[PDB]
Amino acid sequence: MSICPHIQQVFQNEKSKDGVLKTCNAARYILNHSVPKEKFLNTMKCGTCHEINSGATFMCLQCGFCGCWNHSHFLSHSKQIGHIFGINSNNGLLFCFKCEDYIGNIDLINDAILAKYWDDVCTKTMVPSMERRDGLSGLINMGSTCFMSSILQCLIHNPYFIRHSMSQIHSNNCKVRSPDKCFSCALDKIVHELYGALNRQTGFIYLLTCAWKIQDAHEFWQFIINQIHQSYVLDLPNAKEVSRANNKQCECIVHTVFEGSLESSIVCPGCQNNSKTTIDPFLDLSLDIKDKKKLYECLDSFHKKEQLKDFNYHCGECNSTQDAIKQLGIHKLPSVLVLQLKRFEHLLNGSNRKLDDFIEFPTYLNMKNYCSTKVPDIIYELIGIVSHKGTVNEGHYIAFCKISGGQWFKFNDSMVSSISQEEVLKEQAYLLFYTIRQVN
Amino acid sequence: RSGDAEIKGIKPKVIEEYSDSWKSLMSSAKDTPLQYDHMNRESLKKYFDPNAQLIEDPLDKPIQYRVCEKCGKPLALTAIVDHLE
Amino acid sequence: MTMDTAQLKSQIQQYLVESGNYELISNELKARLLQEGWVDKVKDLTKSEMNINESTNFTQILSTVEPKALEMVSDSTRETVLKQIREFLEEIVDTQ
Amino acid sequence: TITIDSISNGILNNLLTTLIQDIVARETTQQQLLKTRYPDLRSYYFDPNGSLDINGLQKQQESSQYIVSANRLAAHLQRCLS
Ligand SMILES: [Zn+2]
Ligand SMILES: [Zn+2]
Ligand SMILES: [Zn+2]
Ligand SMILES: [Zn+2]
Ligand SMILES: [Zn+2]
Ligand SMILES: [Zn+2]
Ligand SMILES: [Zn+2]
Ligand SMILES: [Zn+2]
């Protein structure tokens, strides 16, 4: 594989290199900070033909001109004026019009926000190793622990959590600074183990050690997210803050990513009193699946009006014995929406059974018909699945995760194995992890 | 209306109601919050947490990181400087 | 007196943008392409074309992806977005 | 010259090609990067028997799993951490 030699040439000059990187960072900054209209008109408009989006539009590296792809207008600019590099305004990527290719494989250009520190970053950090670059790695079952490791896999392949952990924000603020005592510190060792270099079971052991000081994967998901929150709270500076996060609004990773809220509407038909109506935080939604076949059917069923049967009920206000009518609706959507399919039916006789119904779930899920009051398309992308294999009593949990570039992996204890979208979609899903992808 | 009709011009009606270099957007961009490509801001303020984190198209590149040669920690680009100093 | 058609095409696109309707059209389109599996099909098709051509050269690869990516758009999405675009154009222009 | 049909189609094609070009740029530069960074690169292994992991290996038995027989490790912890 070749590196572009035109840009290598330019980089032999020390001013020019510096100029290219300032321009690359500014272009990229501008693209992240231009309201859609200004972007269309000032970075997506060809200076030669004046069309918007004539294929990709490229912002010249050496002058203010923007030129399109479809009519070879940036190309003409490069030939007529000698400017052979432009930045694609949809994605910040640098194109060489002599190579007729993107310059993709030069870490400094990719990491151009660190230009001013580059010699240090070069000599003191390294690129990921081929084997760790996607953090793929299994966790050995250590005595009925797939209920924990399944969720952990989904957590360490969650983009929000990986960015959080690798940004060192917990590491920088933690008052415990022990992975034997602090769950968030244990999670960081896991990430450290899987993505850098610290078998690859130490963070997990430490996690189990954090748990010694005090079954269902859904329970563990709630347990672990709650403990990330507690760690955040434990790190706060004073009592006003501890109180604020606990009672008003928490800005922790868990509460700015996974939490939404439901409107529980309860309304009497005769007179409309709705004072049993509430708005409640959720960190996931539990869906019934008896006799249904598709995830959208379970969501309709979650969101539909039902009559509350309540022995000898009379509405406080109007005295009607008519069943009050309840309806759940999403009031606030979270960035990562986690759905639980209720498979473990705990019955009146004490005897659980497991529901094995296959429920069809989409790779792209649209939540618009489940939000409360015309609501616009709100689309999430599937990135995580936890499945339960076997009996209520004797059973085991598997995780499936989607990583960058759309490739899917099955995590079955120590075994990690490749798998296709098409076969993952045939799974008996227990938990589903969806990440916010488009809001219209 | 006809798809095949030759277009004369822009309606005067509409004109009566409306109305250089890419580097010159910088002033404005400096004074403009973080924009998304396909996540409408009024819908965000309405249907999402006031403090939601959003990573748009999160699976459309790996998380960019480098690993410290001293302790092996995977470091995000914007955390490397700090972790050196 | 003849008007410059190229420039006119540019004003039209620009008025679309200033109304907010270019964003709506573009957002509708992407949501449809996402939901119908098209974005993923394109990404697969790209990988298949890199492998076959043992090349990562953008220009070469696009040359064989784009036409196919164009044909892969469902007719429903195509028809539906084209109508939306036509209706907005009838607000903006005069015909003869 | 220009009509409602021609302009509509122009716009759609502008949007589609822009989108396609963008998706293609991301794939190809990702690949260019991965093959430059790792001259030695293997892709992840895919067993259709559904039986070999990502390095084309089988699952180790947990008797052979050791750190302490791995499968008893939480049991060993209960004790040993006291
Ligand atoms: Zn042009
Ligand atoms: Zn130029
Ligand atoms: Zn070149
Ligand atoms: Zn900690
Ligand atoms: Zn919190
Ligand atoms: Zn009443
Ligand atoms: Zn270090
Ligand atoms: Zn021990």
Descriptive account of the structure:
- The complex is a heterotetramer of chains A (440), B (85), C (96) and D (82).
- Chain A has 440 residues and is α+β, with helices and mostly antiparallel strands.
- Chain A folds into two domains: 1-126, Zinc/RING finger domain, C3HC4 (zinc finger) (Herpes Virus-1, 2-Layer Sandwich), CATH 3.30.40.10; 129-440, Cysteine proteinases (Cathepsin B, Chain A, Alpha-Beta Complex), CATH 3.90.70.10.
- Chain A contains 15 helices and 20 strands.
- In chain A, helix 7 crosses helix 12 (217-234) and helix 10 runs antiparallel to helix 11.
- With 85 residues, chain B is an alpha+beta fold.
- Chain B has one domain.
- Chain B has a two-stranded antiparallel sheet.
- The termini of chain B are far apart.
- In chain B, 24% of the residues are buried.
- Chain C has 96 residues and is mainly alpha-helical.
- Chain C has one domain: Serum Albumin, Chain A, Domain 1 (Orthogonal Bundle), CATH 1.10.246.
- Chain C is elongated and about 55 Å long.
- Chain D has 82 residues and is mostly helical.
- Among the domains of chain D are: 1-38, Helix Hairpins (Orthogonal Bundle); 65-82, Classic Zinc Finger (Double Stranded RNA Binding Domain).
- The interface between A and B is large, with 79 and 57 residues.
- Strand 6 (125-126) of chain A pairs antiparallel with strand 2 (65-68) of chain B.
- One zinc ion (ZN) binds next to helix 4 of chain A.
- Chain C: Component of the 1.8 MDa SAGA (Spt-Ada-Gcn5 acetyltransferase) complex, which is composed of 19 subunits TRA1, SPT7, TAF5, NGG1/ADA3, SGF73, SPT20/ADA5, SPT8, TAF12, TAF6, HFI1/ADA1, UBP8, GCN5, ADA2, SPT3, SGF29, TAF10, TAF9, SGF11 and SUS1.
- Chain C: InterPro entries: TF_ENY2, TF_EnY2_sf.
- Chain C: There is a cross-link at residue 68 (Glycyl lysine isopeptide (Lys-Gly) (interchain with G-Cter in ubiquitin)).
- Chain C: This is SAGA complex subunit SUS1.
